Amino acid sequence: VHHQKLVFFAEDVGSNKGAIIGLMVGGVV
Amino acid sequence: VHHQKLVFFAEDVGSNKGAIIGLMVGGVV
Amino acid sequence: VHHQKLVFFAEDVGSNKGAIIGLMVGGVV
Amino acid sequence: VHHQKLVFFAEDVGSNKGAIIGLMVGGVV
Amino acid sequence: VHHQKLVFFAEDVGSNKGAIIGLMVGGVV
Amino acid sequence: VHHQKLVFFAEDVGSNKGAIIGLMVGGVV
Amino acid sequence: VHHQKLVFFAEDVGSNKGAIIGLMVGGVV
Amino acid sequence: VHHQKLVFFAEDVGSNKGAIIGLMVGGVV
């Protein structure tokens, strides 16, 4: 049977500060 | 507490030659 | 000898914002 | 929750010639 | 005497959005 | 359901005279 | 006493839609 | 012992490949 990609994301932003984050996401199989 | 976004993706990749499609995706409520 | 090309897609958009993605796609018989 | 887009395509070539066609295709729901 | 040139095609249309494709196509052996 | 078309093409162009033909074709089923 | 010509064709009649196409074909002399 | 509030995160990885993403997130002052 095929292996097919599902993903959960929630991004954290508030009052301007800085962190490790970024998001643009690519992947399959 | 925070709500999560559920997303599926499939990108198209074979015996290598190339196309326009693209994906690196990100965004929040 | 002949392979049939079949592909699944779903693009990601809700509420106007941005990401990097595109969809068009190419490959040929 | 909604359904996945399914794409099938055969491009017609035998013997070197020319035609009008394009494909780089995209859509969701 | 020559083998018969046979054309199969399907174009992608549904619920209104839009894509890049085109097709009106030609050839002979 | 609608009835399925089977059609074969080879195109007629020479020294200018005429007939009725054109061919660059799009369709489904 | 010259050698004869034969041809094969499929001519244009369908359930009405369009693309650029016709074949219904003949010559003189 | 100082008491601590907790947060859950998800980074996207199973099976080695890559993407541009992170969230592991903080702030100071």
From Swiss-Prot, chains A, B, C, D, E, F, G, H:
Record-marked site positions (Implicated in free radical propagation): 22
Region (Interaction with PSEN1) location: 13-29
Annotated phenotype, changing residue 12 to N: In CAA-APP; Iowa type
Binding residue positions for Cu(2+) 2: 2-3
Effect on the protein upon substituting residue 22 to V: Reduced protein oxidation. No hippocampal neuron toxicity
Domain of life: Eukaryota
Binding site for Zn(2+) 2: 2-3
Susceptible to oxidation, annotated site positions: 24
Residues of the site described as Cleavage: 5-6, 8-9
Variant or mutagenesis effect after changing residue 13 to C: Causes formation of an artifactual disulfide bond with PSEN1
Full protein name: P3(40)
Gene name as annotated: APP
Parent-protein start and end of this portion: 683 to 711 of 770
